[PDB]
Structure formats: C-alpha cells, structure tokens
Amino acid sequence: MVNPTVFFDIAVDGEPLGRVSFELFADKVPKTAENFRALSTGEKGFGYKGSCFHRIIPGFMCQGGDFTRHNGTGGKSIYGEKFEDENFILKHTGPGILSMANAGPNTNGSQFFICTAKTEWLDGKHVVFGKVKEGMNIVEAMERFGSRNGKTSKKITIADCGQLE
Numbered sequence: 001m002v003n004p005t006v007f008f009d010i011a012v013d014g015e016p017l018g019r020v021s022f023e024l025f026a027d028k029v030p031k032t033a034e035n036f037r038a039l040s041t042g043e044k045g046f047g048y049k050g051s052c053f054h055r056i057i058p059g060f061m062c063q064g065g066d067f068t069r070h071n072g073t074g075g076k077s078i079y080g081e082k083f084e085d086e087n088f089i090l091k092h093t094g095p096g097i098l099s100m101a102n103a104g105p106n107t108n109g110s111q112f113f114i115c116t117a118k119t120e121w122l123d124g125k126h127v128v129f130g131k132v133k134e135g136m137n138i139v140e141a142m143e144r145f146g147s148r149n150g151k152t153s154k155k156i157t158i159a160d161c162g163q164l165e
C-alpha cells in the first residue's frame with residue numbers, strides 16, 4: 001500500500017561516496033516499479049549490485065542498470081529480456097525523476113536514468129516510475145564525473161543496493 005523505497009550505495013573508483021534512496025511509484029506503475037525493486041534486492045538472482053552508471057551527462061541525466069553489457073546495450077527485466085511500456089501517467093518534471101531507458105516502443109529491460117534536469121521531450125516515450133527521495137546531493141556529486149558525451153572520468157558503481165524499511 002505504501003510505495004516501496006530502495007537504496008543504492010554509490011562508489012567512485014571503489015571509494016564510498018554516499019547513498020541515494022528512491023521512492024518507487026508502485027501505486028501508479030506497479031509492474032515497472034516491481035522490476036526495479038527486485039533488481040535492487042537481487043532476489044531473482046541478478047540485478048543492480050556491482051553495476052555502473054555508464055553514461056552521465058551533466059545537465060541531463062545519469063544512466064545505469066546495464067548489468068549484462070556494462071555499456072548501454074544490455075540488461076534484462078525480471079519478466080524476460082524486455083517488457084512493455086506500462087503507462088505514461090507520470091511525466092519528466094525535473095531533477096530526481098527515475099525513468100526507464102529503452103530502445104524503442106515496449107523494450108524496457110533493466111536500464112534506467114535519473115534526471116538531473118527537466119526532460120519533458122521524453123514524456124510519453126519513457127516510463128517514469130520513481131523519484132529520488134534522499135541523496136540528491138549524491139546524485140549531483142555523481143553528475144560531476146560525467147561529460148558532454150556521457151563518458152565518466154571515474155568509475156561510478158552501485159557498491160550495494162536493496163530495499164529499505
């Protein structure tokens with residue numbers, strides 16, 4: 001009934017940086033929320049722990065969740081390789097929005113992005129399913145290791161992750 005909360009403990013070239021928590025909008029996009037939740041606990045036998053934010057563009061977004069290819073070409077959902085666009089009820093309203101990366105209609109896997117600006121042109125194209133709850137300062141710290149083309153100057157990893165409460 002209460003939207004679940006997940007955390008990522010972030011590291012920068014293996015050094016602890018801090019924790020980012022997310023609210024997942026299970027109330028609005030249950031299927032998409034449950035995928036991310038489960039990938040964050042690792043309870044299906046695979047998931048985000050030890051993966052990296054392979055593409056970070058300051059003033060746009062931090063993208064991750066490619067635990068099979070490590071570069072934006074991989075990843076898989078708890079439902080199969082890909083799953084449908086659940087709905088587009090929620091919009092890309094500003095920094096902190098958590099949304100699904102994809103490669104076309106109905107191609108959600110595990111890759112996601114955290115917005116660091118309003119990205120309204122993505123509305124109706126990417127499924128928004130959560131928001132940063134605590135540690136937007138850590139996201140901003142992460143964002144500083146990105147670049148215009150998205151290549152990071154240090155390796156930004158999810159050293160640990162899971163579900164809070």
Ligand SMILES: Cc1cccnc1N
Binds near residue numbers: 080082083084
């Ligand atoms: C999007 C999707 C869902 C289930 C099976 N195949 C697919 N491509």
Ligand SMILES: Cc1cccnc1N
Binds near residue numbers: 101102107108109110
């Ligand atoms: C396979 C893939 C590539 C880029 C974004 N999402 C995906 N599921």
